[PDB]
């Protein structure tokens, strides 16, 4: 088996398509998209470091010096061929991609209904990205891959749910690690309990989990942490640093994380964009302090694909540094690499277009941090 | 005003009782020298 160790990204291959969508209270002009860049340097909190499809993570991982394979299905039309060509030019392994000649890539058949006086839609025919069967899996890829990566978008499709669980069994049989990068799509933000029930099985099937701060707080309690953020003492601060009215970087205790912990979880990472990387392991926990600067390039900055770069950097360091799971100092040092990768990825328009290379990421990491933190 | 610079890496060795404490125009403690002081650098 060649080096570096292979990773597998399972799910849909799409161009852009950030899944995490919520309501923002600061909209720009509905027509003048030249104003919408001001929401890139003053983003909604859930969109600070947005993730995307697993193909973004695969491309970013390959650009950071790793070897990746994509497992999914595309149609036999022009769009599927173009997506496969884009993944191939990025040196992502395509042997796990299954073609469907009778399906239209990234197209879903829906029926519009008017239940209870409101327009609604229901899926008639699923797209080929959500129509991968367990018999179409690539067993060589699942055998070679050391990390298995997927998003919660597949949980919105029953076919992909069954295929994902079969693939997880296959990967665990061969010794691979399961990376659950949540990336909650629009439907999965409706209420906490239904999402917890929907993601419980995949959550317990994962060794590595990455969630955003908003995702974790939604999964535990949104109102409690919103109230805790808004609290201000009436008379005097409890310490001087609380007098500065600095941005809140609250580090969740493992006791608060206890509902979401299970036995096979080796590492949980909570990302507040690139600013904070809260990590939790069975033995220890902590936070990696990062930064961001999209105002350095106000006319080319774009946060799309930043979380993909962070996750790809995490996987790149995990595949080559097994001591990350057991050493806290090594874990922080290697997570600074993912912080730098996420920082660079915010400087370009387009997720795939702006994915950094390993050389640039290491250069930025050494420039930003003091030499003792390398 | 010329600046004397250390010509080697080493340990500065001199007696502080032959110099008078002062305060520079930059606010730093210093020693005023009025004699032919000899300073040893243990390179």
């Amino acid at each position: 088996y060649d080096d570096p160790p292979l990773v597998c990204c399972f799910g849909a291959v799409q161009k852009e398509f950030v899944p995490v969508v919520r309501v923002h209270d600061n909209p720009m002009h509905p027509d003048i998209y030249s104003q919408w860049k001001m929401l890139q340097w003053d983003p909604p909190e859930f969109g600070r470091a947005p993730g995307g499809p697993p193909s973004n993570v695969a491309i970013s991982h390959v650009r950071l010096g790793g070897r990746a394979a994509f497992m999914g299905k595309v149609g036999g039309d022009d769009y599927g061929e173009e997506l496969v060509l884009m993944m191939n030019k990025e040196r992502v392994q395509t042997r796990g991609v299954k073609f469907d000649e009778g399906a239209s890539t990234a197209c879903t058949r829906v029926k519009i209904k008017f239940e209870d006086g409101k327009m609604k839609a229901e899926t008639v025919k699923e797209p080929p990205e959500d129509s991968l069967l367990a018999s179409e899996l690539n067993l060589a890829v699942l055998k070679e891959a050391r990390i298995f990566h997927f998003n919660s978008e597949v949980l919105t499709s029953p076919t992909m749910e069954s295929t994902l669980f079969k693939a997880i069994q296959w990967s665990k049989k061969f010794g691979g690690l399961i990376f659950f990068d949540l990336n909650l799509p629009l439907p999965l933000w409706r209420s906490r309990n239904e999402t917890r029930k929907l993601i419980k099985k995949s959550w317990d099937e994962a060794n590595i989990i990455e969630v955003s701060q908003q995702e974790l707080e939604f999964l535990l309690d949104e109102e409690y942490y919103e109230r805790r953020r808004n609290y201000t003492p009436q008379y005097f601060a409890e310490d001087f640093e609380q007098t500065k009215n600095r941005r809140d970087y609250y580090h969740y205790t493992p006791e608060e994380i206890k509902p979401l912990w299970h036995d096979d979880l080796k590492l949980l990472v909570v990302t507040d964009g690139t600013l904070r990387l809260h990590y939790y392991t069975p033995k220890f926990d902590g936070v990696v302090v990062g930064t961001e600067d999209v105002l350095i390039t106000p006319f080319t900055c774009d946060r799309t694909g930043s979380g993909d770069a962070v996750v790809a950097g995490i996987m790149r360091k995990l595949t080559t540094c097994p001591e990350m799971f057991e050493d806290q100092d090594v874990l922080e040092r290697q997570l600074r690499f993912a912080v730098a990768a996420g920082i660079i990825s915010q400087w370009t328009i387009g997720a795939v277009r702006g994915f950094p290379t390993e050389s640039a990421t290491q250069n930025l990491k050494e420039q930003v941090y003091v030499p003792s933190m390398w | 005003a010329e600046h004397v610079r250390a010509p080697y890496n080493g340990k500065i060795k001199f007696n502080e009782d032959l110099v008078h404490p002062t305060r520079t125009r930059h606010g730093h403690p210093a020693f005023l020298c009025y004699i032919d002081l000899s300073v040893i650098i243990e390179s």
Binding site: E16, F17, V18 | -
Partner: protein
């Protein structure tokens, strides 16, 4: 005297409901977008070009998910950008496309599916 710079009109959930309920002669293309979404700028320009292409042979509308979040969730929108191609024939079924699909893809869908 001065032409408007944008041809794609922004509609509410109720207005889109009335448009879909009413009789339609040309295909209707519904865009779901948010101003905080980076990919939506490119989709906005692409749909402006498409609207210029189809002068009166198609209808291009956009719905902001920051004003119609529940409506977007009801219509099975899982992310942005998301397009809905609604055929003038009520018997047929609409097509939902996810991602920054090419302009030629939209042309093909409109020509051979609506």
């Amino acid at each position: 005297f001065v032409r408007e710079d944008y041809l794609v009109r922004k509609l509410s959930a109720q207005e889109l409901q009335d448009l879909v309920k009413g009789e339609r002669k040309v295909p209707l293309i519904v865009d779901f977008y948010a101003t905080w979404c980076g990919p939506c700028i490119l989709m906005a320009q692409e749909l402006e070009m498409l609207a210029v292409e189809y002068e009166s042979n198609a209808m291009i509308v956009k719905v902001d998910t920051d004003d119609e979040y529940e409506f977007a969730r009801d219509m099975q929108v899982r992310g942005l950008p998301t397009l809905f191609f609604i055929s003038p024939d009520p018997s047929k079924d609409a097509i939902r496309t996810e991602g920054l699909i090419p302009l030629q893809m939209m042309r093909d869908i409109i020509d051979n599916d609506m």
